[PDB]
């Protein structure tokens, strides 16, 4: 018929503020005609941009994560986005897994200041220390429960009360990762600690007002 480029036109996906790359990506959409306009279905699209790629221009090991972005406005070719999750993939976990060891996973839900309701998932793995001579060096149920109990407290407590883009700024620079580390070290230690998934559960949609505040300026 028309065929695809003939069909689709091209649009510049743009970040929110606290994003280093801001007119960061693009996307194409079908040629608008009678009734049928391009911008809509894009709000419902979710964009993964790599967390390193967006907020770093370079070397940084957080590139293991990518952020889900759903489109909040289109203005021109360009369309100003918000945060929906920062996730990762399989590979990390598995290189990071070691078997004949031990798992602690945890999730908490906290509502942002924003009312972006987020569920946030965490992970970390045992060790034999320097020289825990012991055959495969695990941890009790008490331990695991107790660690979760500390972990969870912080994350919700700290995350509930916070601005979303800023939830992101901490999640980027992984001061939060470390923060967990702060609580975790005097206990049974493991190695690691990561934010492995973070899920947007709830969103209170737009306000140009909210948008500028989130967007900042391109």
């Amino acid at each position: 018929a028309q065929e695809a480029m003939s069909r689709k036109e091209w649009y510049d996906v743009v970040a929110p503020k606290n994003f280093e790359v801001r007119q960061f990506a693009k996307t194409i959409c079908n040629k608008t005609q009678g009734t049928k306009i391009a911008a809509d279905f894009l709000r419902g699209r979710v964009y993964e941009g790599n967390l390193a790629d967006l907020n770093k221009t370079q070397n940084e090991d957080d590139a293991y994560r990518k952020v889900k972005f759903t489109v909040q406005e289109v203005q021109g070719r360009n369309l100003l986005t918000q945060f929906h999750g920062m996730d990762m993939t399989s590979d990390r976990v598995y290189y990071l897994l070691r078997k004949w060891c031990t798992t602690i996973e945890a999730t908490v839900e906290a509502k942002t200041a924003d009312g972006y309701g987020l569920r946030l998932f965490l992970i970390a793995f045992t060790k034999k220390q320097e020289n825990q001579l012991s055959k495969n060096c695990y941890a009790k149920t008490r331990l695991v429960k107790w660690v979760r109990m500390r972990a969870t407290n912080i994350i919700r407590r700290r995350l509930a009360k916070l601005d979303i883009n800023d939830a992101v700024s901490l999640l980027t620079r992984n001061i939060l990762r470390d923060r967990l580390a702060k609580r975790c070290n005097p206990i049974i230690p493991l190695r690691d600690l990561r934010i492995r998934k973070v899920k947007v559960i709830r969103t209170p949609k737009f306000d140009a007002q909210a948008l500028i505040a989130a967007h900042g300026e391109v």
Partner: protein, 125 residues
């Protein structure tokens, strides 16, 4: 040029994704923007041959990868992320034969590489 919007089509990176799907009877090439809500194009080894005993094959895949590159170029998807998947929640997370031939082929056939993924899903049976 069917570049009809904010090119300069290889001057700057321009990423889509090829969701590469190799079953054990065919191999699927599915080109996206960034979510297939708007799908670009999807090319198969079966689309590219018929044999009933082949079609997820490196041969076919190698062949397949060519067409795709041509169309891809034609649209200008300078760069491309690959999301390979097996058949699914079944098979041992190892896709049909062709997947390497095709993959290698895209770079061989004109892709600057960056960002590869296995995306076949996690079962509860």
């Amino acid at each position: 040029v069917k570049y009809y919007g904010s090119s300069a089509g290889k001057d700057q990176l321009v990423y889509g994704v090829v969701h590469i799907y190799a079953s054990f009877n065919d191999t699927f090439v599915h080109v996206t923007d960034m979510s297939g809500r708007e799908t670009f194009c999807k090319v198969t080894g079966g689309m590219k041959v018929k044999a009933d005993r082949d079609e997820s094959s490196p041969y076919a895949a190698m062949m397949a990868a060519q067409d795709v590159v041509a169309r891809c170029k034609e649209c200008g998807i300078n760069a491309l992320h690959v999301k390979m998947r097996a058949t699914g929640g079944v098979g041992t997370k190892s896709p049909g034969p062709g997947a390497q031939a095709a993959l290698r082929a895209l770079a061989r056939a004109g892709m600057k590489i960056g960002r590869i993924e296995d995306v076949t899903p996690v079962p509860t049976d």
